[PDB]
Amino acid sequence: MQTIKCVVVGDGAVGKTCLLISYTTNKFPSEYVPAVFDNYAVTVMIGGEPYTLGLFDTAGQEDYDRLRPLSYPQTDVFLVCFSVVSPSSFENVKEKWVPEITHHCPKTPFLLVGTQIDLRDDPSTIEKLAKNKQKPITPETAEKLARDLKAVKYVECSALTQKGLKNVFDEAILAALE
């Protein structure tokens, strides 16, 4: 209980980096991304009881056989991030993440977060989809996928505005107790 380990991972997600950096100091635009990606540790004050928080993010490598599972994951909280503006990203959650989770041995609470709301497929974007007749998927269609097995809870956040972190900020504390 001295420290809380949490891992962050999403399916591709082009704005995956901007999501992590925006939390460190705000930077959705990420006009310029850093070369090598390093990990950052931050602590939050709560009722006067500061707790350290370790954030882990994949930075390519892979070919180094990092082996996240380490035959014994030390993560007590698993976070997932996906976009609801693209269709292929919707199936990717079930085609790869649903089965891949088996390697992690579903024995811990999972949280499903929806990001990129508000944009809901900006107009210029829905036009590009209209040509392929894809159309964006609604959050209700995604919520059913989480309740397909045993999703603990689902939440939506807007990174474009500070309305996204405020939603996942209160929920993040709940995991701290666990």
Side-chain angles (χ1 to χ4, degrees):
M1 296 185 186
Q2 295 178 345
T3 196
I4 303 174
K5 295 185 184 87
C6 187
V7 182
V8 183
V9 66
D11 185 83
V14 283
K16 185 183 186 207
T17 306
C18 309
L19 185 69
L20 185 66
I21 303 307
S22 65
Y23 183 85
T24 65
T25 342
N26 205 62
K27 195 182 190 354
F28 344 119
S30 71
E31 296 297 341
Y32 183 84
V33 316
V36 304
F37 297 93
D38 294 346
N39 296 340
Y40 300 95
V42 305
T43 82
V44 184
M45 294 185 183
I46 302 175
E49 287 264 67
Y51 298 101
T52 70
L53 185 68
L55 305 184
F56 192 85
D57 187 5
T58 305
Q61 293 181 352
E62 188 185 2
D63 291 348
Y64 294 75
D65 188 5
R66 185 185 299 165
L67 189 66
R68 240 177 169 165
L70 298 178
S71 198
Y72 254 116
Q74 299 178 349
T75 303
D76 186 6
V77 183
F78 291 89
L79 304 183
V80 301
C81 191
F82 72 97
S83 299
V84 79
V85 175
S86 213
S88 187
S89 68
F90 188 91
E91 295 183 351
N92 295 344
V93 173
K94 186 183 185 216
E95 295 183 351
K96 295 185 184 264
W97 280 112
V98 148
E100 185 184 1
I101 196 80
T102 65
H103 296 301
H104 297 89
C105 219
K107 294 185 183 244
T108 23
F110 294 94
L111 296 92
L112 185 72
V113 182
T115 69
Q116 207 184 173
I117 205 161
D118 295 346
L119 288 74
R120 295 183 301 165
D121 208 38
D122 255 61
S124 67
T125 308
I126 201 171
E127 293 182 352
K128 186 183 187 161
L129 303 183
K131 185 183 186 216
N132 300 140
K133 298 185 186 81
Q134 291 177 346
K135 247 165 139 176
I137 307 310
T138 29
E140 186 184 2
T141 307
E143 185 184 1
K144 295 185 185 155
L145 184 66
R147 201 79 227 315
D148 187 5
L149 305 185
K150 295 186 185 241
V152 173
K153 189 182 187 179
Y154 75 95
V155 299
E156 299 183 350
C157 17
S158 191
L160 184 67
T161 76
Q162 306 301 312
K163 192 180 185 285
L165 303 311
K166 293 184 184 193
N167 195 19
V168 308
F169 184 85
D170 294 347
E171 294 297 342
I173 301 174
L174 184 67
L177 303 184
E178 296 297 342

